[PDB]
């Protein structure tokens, strides 16, 4: 199905991030984020039978954890948190993360929690498991400069590579 | 043998630890052909110097025992650096 | 603890690392192993300032915060030519091209 192909792609993208920690317990995440600056985050497999993935993020009070729901081909933040209409849905889980990082980068949301009960997620920098390839680091840099990769003065082989991962994080 | 010399298109000579240069799949195939010297006739020094910093950073930060910091890349070099990185397989 | 450096002279650039508690003299011992010139034929510099051989790299200002693997600090090198030391001379790297309009 096209649903299955979109989920396979989402997991491929996840393997390119360099900040997907796979099998990692909630306590191992807690230890890994303990000394990190506020907003440092990672993604890992959830321990919960009903969820694939969980975000672990440093807050000023310590690391906390937020599950990601997948339902009918769409990812969104765990809906026990807020009404689902306020939790944007994405075909791609890296896209989901990129959206929330960019909201903070653009200072549309900050570290202070909102006062009307809308979603509070302060993300700054990912915690890498390992240094990514230089090619991927260039890719991130180009993505932060433009979305119009098919006009770049690059060979088509390298545009294909940029097209595989258009995120800024 | 401990170090290797990488030469840019504009004549700059970069001396780097051999283990570090082996970060590049392309350099690795050349040494592990030819001397302990590789000439890059199409990579200029403002790019090759950055590639060498990436070698240092990749070797240092394979483990995550230390928080991995950001590797800075000026937008003005990113297109050439992407091509060099692709050529070098790193 | 660890500092990451580029030792630069004319169009030579050595990528190497040392400890914050390493001495300038120990740095010249690195240079001698690579470039085959003894320490008494070397002068090392931070910017325009001659570094005293007996100082640690931290005492000269090379700290882990300012000499990182992804942004190494630059140490200038000048050799002794017979009686006289050469002027410090570091050749610049090439200049990057202008950005395409889409990425400005
Ligand atoms: O974080 C914690 C406390 C905790 C911290 C460190 C630690 F070592 C163990 C527990 N409690 C979570 C639930 C939770 C737990 C475990 C998990 O991991 P999983 O079972 O592996 O999926 C997933 C979720 C929670 O109260 N969140 C509310 C919330 C809402 C909005 C927001 F933006 C961020 C957070």
Swiss-Prot record, chain A:
Substrate-recognition component of a cullin-5-RING E3 ubiquitin-protein ligase complex (ECS complex, also named CRL5 complex), which mediates the ubiquitination and subsequent proteasomal degradation of target proteins, such as EPOR and GHR. Specifically recognizes and binds phosphorylated proteins via its SH2 domain, promoting their ubiquitination. The ECS(SOCS2) complex acts as a key regulator of growth hormone receptor (GHR) levels by mediating ubiquitination and degradation of GHR, following GHR phosphorylation by JAK2. Changing residue 58 to R: No effect on protein half-life. Substrate-recognition component of the ECS(SOCS2) complex, composed of SOCS2, CUL5, ELOB, ELOC and RNF7/RBX2. Interacts with IGF1R. Interacts with DCUN1D1. The modification Phosphoserine is found at residue 23. Changing residue 104 to Y: Does not affect ability to bind phosphorylated substrates. This is Suppressor of cytokine signaling 2. Substrate-binding is prevented by the covalent inhibitor MN551 that cross-links with Cys-82. Also inhibited by a MN551 derivative, MN714, which contains a pivaloyloxymethyl that allows cell permeability. Residues 19-127 form the SH2 domain. Keywords: Cytoplasm, Growth regulation, Isopeptide bond, Phosphoprotein, SH2 domain, Signal transduction inhibitor, Ubl conjugation, Ubl conjugation pathway. One of its GO terms (molecular function) is phosphorylation-dependent protein binding.
Swiss-Prot record, chain B:
Overexpressed in prostate cancer cell line PC-3 and breast cancer cell line SK-BR-3. Gene3D superfamilies: Potassium Channel Kv1.1, Chain A. Ubiquitinated by the DCX(AMBRA1) complex, leading to its degradation by the proteasome. GO terms for molecular function: protein-macromolecule adaptor activity; transcription corepressor binding. GO terms for cellular component: Cul2-RING ubiquitin ligase complex; Cul5-RING ubiquitin ligase complex; cytosol; elongin complex; nucleoplasm. GO terms for biological process: protein ubiquitination; regulation of transcription by RNA polymerase II; target-directed miRNA degradation; transcription initiation at RNA polymerase II promoter; ubiquitin-dependent protein catabolic process. Heterotrimer of an A (ELOA, ELOA2 or ELOA3P), ELOB and ELOC subunit. The elongin BC complex interacts with EPOP; leading to recruit the elongin BC complex to Polycomb group (PcG) target genes, thereby restricting excessive activity of the PRC2/EED-EZH2 complex. (Microbial infection) Interacts with HIV-1 Vif; forming an active cullin-5-RING E3 ubiquitin-protein ligase complex (ECS complex). This is Elongin-C. The gene is ELOC.
UniProtKB/Swiss-Prot annotation, chain C:
Keywords: Acetylation, Host-virus interaction, Nucleus, Phosphoprotein, Transcription, Transcription regulation, Ubl conjugation pathway. Signal peptide: none annotated. PROSITE patterns: UBIQUITIN_2. InterPro entries: ELOB, Ubiquitin-like_dom, Ubiquitin-like_domsf. GO terms for biological process: positive regulation of proteasomal ubiquitin-dependent protein catabolic process; protein ubiquitination; protein-containing complex assembly; target-directed miRNA degradation; transcription elongation by RNA polymerase II; transcription initiation at RNA polymerase II promoter. The modification Phosphothreonine is found at residue 84. The modification N-acetylmethionine is found at residue 1. SIII, also known as elongin, is a general transcription elongation factor that increases the RNA polymerase II transcription elongation past template-encoded arresting sites. Subunit A is transcriptionally active and its transcription activity is strongly enhanced by binding to the dimeric complex of the SIII regulatory subunits B and C (elongin BC complex). This is Elongin-B. It comes from Homo sapiens (Human).
């Amino acid at each position: 199905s096209m649903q299955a192909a979109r989920l396979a792609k989402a997991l491929r993208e996840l393997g390119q991030t360099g900040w997907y920690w796979g099998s990692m317990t909630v306590n191992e995440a807690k230890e890994k984020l303990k000394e990190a600056p506020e907003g440092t985050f990672l993604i890992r497999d959830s321990s919960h039978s009903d969820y694939l993935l969980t975000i672990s993020v440093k807050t000023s009070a310590g690391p906390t954890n937020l599950r990601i729901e997948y339902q009918d081909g769409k990812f969104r933040l765990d809906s026990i948190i807020c009404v689902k209409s306020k939790l944007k849905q994405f075909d791609s889980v890296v896209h989901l993360i990129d959206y929330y990082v960019q909201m903070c980068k653009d200072k549309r949301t900050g570290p202070e929690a909102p006062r009307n009960g809308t979603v509070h997620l302060y993300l700054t920098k990912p915690l890498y498991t390992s240094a990514p390839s230089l090619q991927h680091l260039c890719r991130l840099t180009i993505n932060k400069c433009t979305g119009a990769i098919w006009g770049l003065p690059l060979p088509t082989r390298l545009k294909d590579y940029l097209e595989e991962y258009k995120f800024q994080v | 043998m401990m170090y290797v010399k990488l030469i840019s298109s504009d004549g700059h000579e970069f001396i780097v630890k051999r283990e570090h240069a082996l970060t590049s799949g392309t350099i690795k195939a050349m040494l592990s052909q030819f001397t302990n010297e590789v000439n890059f006739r199409e990579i200029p020094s403002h790019v090759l110097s950055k590639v060498c910093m990436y070698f240092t950073y990749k070797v240092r930060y394979t483990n995550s025992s230390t928080e991995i910091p950001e590797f800075p890349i000026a937008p003005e070099i990113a297109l050439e650096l992407l091509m060099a990185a692709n050529f070098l397989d790193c | 603890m660890d500092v990451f450096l580029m030792i630069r002279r004319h169009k030579t650039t050595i990528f190497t690392d040392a400890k914050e508690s390493s001495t300038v003299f120990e740095l010249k011992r690195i240079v001698e192993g690579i470039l085959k010139r003894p320490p008494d034929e070397q002068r090392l510099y931070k910017d325009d300032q001659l570094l005293d051989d007996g100082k640690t790299l931290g005492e000269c200002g090379f700290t882990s915060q300012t000499a990182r693997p992804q942004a190494p600090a630059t140490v200038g090198l000048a050799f002794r030519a017979d009686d006289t030391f050469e002027a410090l001379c570091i050749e610049p790297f090439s200049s990057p091209p202008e950005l395409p309009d889409v990425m400005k």
